[PDB]
Amino acid sequence: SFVEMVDNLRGKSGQGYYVEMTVGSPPQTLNILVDTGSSNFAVGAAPHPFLHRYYQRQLSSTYRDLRKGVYVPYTQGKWEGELGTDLVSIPHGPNVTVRANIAAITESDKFFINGSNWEGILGLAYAEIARPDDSLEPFFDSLVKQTHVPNLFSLQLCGAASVGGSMIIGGIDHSLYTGSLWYTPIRREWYYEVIIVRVEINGQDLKMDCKEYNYDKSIVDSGTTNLRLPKKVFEAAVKSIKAASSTEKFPDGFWLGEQLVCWQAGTTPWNIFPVISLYLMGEVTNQSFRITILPQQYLRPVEQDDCYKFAISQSSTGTVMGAVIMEGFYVVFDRARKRIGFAVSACHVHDEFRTAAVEGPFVTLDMEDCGYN
Numbered sequence: 001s002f003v004e005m006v007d008n009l010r011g012k013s014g015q016g017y018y019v020e021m022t023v024g025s026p027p028q029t030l031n032i033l034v035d036t037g038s039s040n041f042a043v044g045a046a047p048h049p050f051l052h053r054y055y056q057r058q059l060s061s062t063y064r065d066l067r068k069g070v071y072v073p074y075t076q077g078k079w080e081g082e083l084g085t086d087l088v089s090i091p092h093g094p095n096v097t098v099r100a101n102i103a104a105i106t107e108s109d110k111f112f113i114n115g116s117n118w119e120g121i122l123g124l125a126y127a128e129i130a131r132p133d134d135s136l137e138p139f140f141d142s143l144v145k146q147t148h149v150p151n152l153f154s155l156q157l158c159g160a161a162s163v164g165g166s167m168i169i170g171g172i173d174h175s176l177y178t179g180s181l182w183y184t185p186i187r188r189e190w191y192y193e194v195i196i197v198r199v200e201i202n203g204q205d206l207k208m209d210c211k212e213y214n215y216d217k218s219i220v221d222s223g224t225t226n227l228r229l230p231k232k233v234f235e236a237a238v239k240s241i242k243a244a245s246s247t248e249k250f251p252d253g254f255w256l257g258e259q260l261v262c263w264q265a266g267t268t269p270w271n272i273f274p275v276i277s278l279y280l281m282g283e284v285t286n287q288s289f290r291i292t293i294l295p296q297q298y299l300r301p302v303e304q305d306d307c308y309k310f311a312i313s314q315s316s317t318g319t320v321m322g323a324v325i326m327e328g329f330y331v332v333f334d335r336a337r338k339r340i341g342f343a344v345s346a347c348h349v350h351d352e353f354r355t356a357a358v359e360g361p362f363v364t365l366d367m368e369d370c371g372y373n
């Protein structure tokens with residue numbers, strides 16, 4: 001039955017990954033963004049020029065009004081709507097139906113995207129960051145509460161244009177990754193918050209106080225495209241990546257993610273861009289592990305020539321490990337055990353000389369000092 005969930009995700013580059021769902025009776029089909037960076041389940045529920053379809057509550061015999069408003073602001077986009085409940089299923093997910101909280105979106109601002117093919121969002125993080133407040137049970141909490149689906153899911157995001165992947169609900173599909181799973185503690189159940197204890201670029205330690213890496217917080221967010229870094233860390237990383245690639249020159253707007261860079265088709269100089277290693281807090285005392293990402297992950301292809309946007313960018317709200325970090329890895333959100341596992345994905349990037357990797361164990365002293373308070 002996990003084989004039924006393999007490849008149940010689709011998307012457009014830079015516009016999220018979505019899963020098919022149905023809401024209401026009779027079932028209404030909608031494509032729903034898979035977002036580990038938020039905790040509300042919300043769907044277009046009124047006309048919008050970028051929506052191909054939307055939730056029609058008046059047509060669902062199982063719809064219930066909660067008679068309460070709601071709004072959710074994201075780093076990109078915001079919407080407001082009306083809360084209610086209805087029956088929900090995932091056709092290429094477990095064979096169950098649950099009554100879930102649903103925000104019916106009536107107004108929105110830069111949220112829906114022209115031609116994205118999704119019409120709602122599935123916030124998979126914890127109640128603590130749900131709107132209007134933590135009494136609004138998130139979907140996955142309802143799923144686990146009302147069924148026997150185990151309290152974990154995994155995400156296999158594959159890159160390139162259209163992308164694809166798998167959300168395995170209730171377990172781990174071992175045919176989707178190679179080597180060992182390495183786990184890092186969920187520091188606190190709100191976002192999927194983790195602790196980064198070291199950063200290396202081409203094998204060179206950035207040598208910053210590890211608190212800077214988690215300044216504010218560090219989270220795993222499938223709803224974000226980029227690897228986002230606190231200002232200070234971003235500036236150090238860019239300086240290092242600039243130096244490694246100084247054999248070529250790029251407009252300063254490239255490094256800000258604003259303009260593309262292009263090379264003759266097939267001639268992209270991958271070798272002059274460095275690998276980045278993020279070391280994560282491990283499961284045992286003084287132990288960490290590292291995930292290594294290739295330039296093929298942080299140079300996102302965009303439309304004769306191969307063209308790319310720099311997909312590492314600046315944040316003032318902590319580190320965000322977005323889709324470019326998740327792609328190529330099998331990522332297990334093991335809620336039952338308060339940990340997130342990483343392994344090399346079966347849909348990994350192919351460089352003839354370097355490999356994306358998950359490696360351990362490493363010894364790292366004083367890892368608790370890396371958490372921001």
Ligand SMILES: CCC[C@H](O)[C@H](NC[C@@H]1Cc2cccc(c2)CCCCc2cc(cc(N(CCC)S(C)(=O)=O)c2)C(=O)N1)C(=O)NCC(C)C
Pocket residue numbers: 014015016033035037038039072073074075076077111129221223224225226227228313317320322
């Ligand atoms: C503390 C951080 C929270 C985290 O941002 C988190 N992000 C999840 C959202 C989900 C989302 C919203 C709208 C559209 C999409 C998906 C599809 C992908 C679009 C590209 C994108 C999205 C986000 C963010 C970006 N980027 C940053 C802003 C432009 S980036 C760096 O270009 O990839 C791009 C982003 O914020 N997605 C969040 O907003 N949570 C809010 C609630 C908890 C209140």
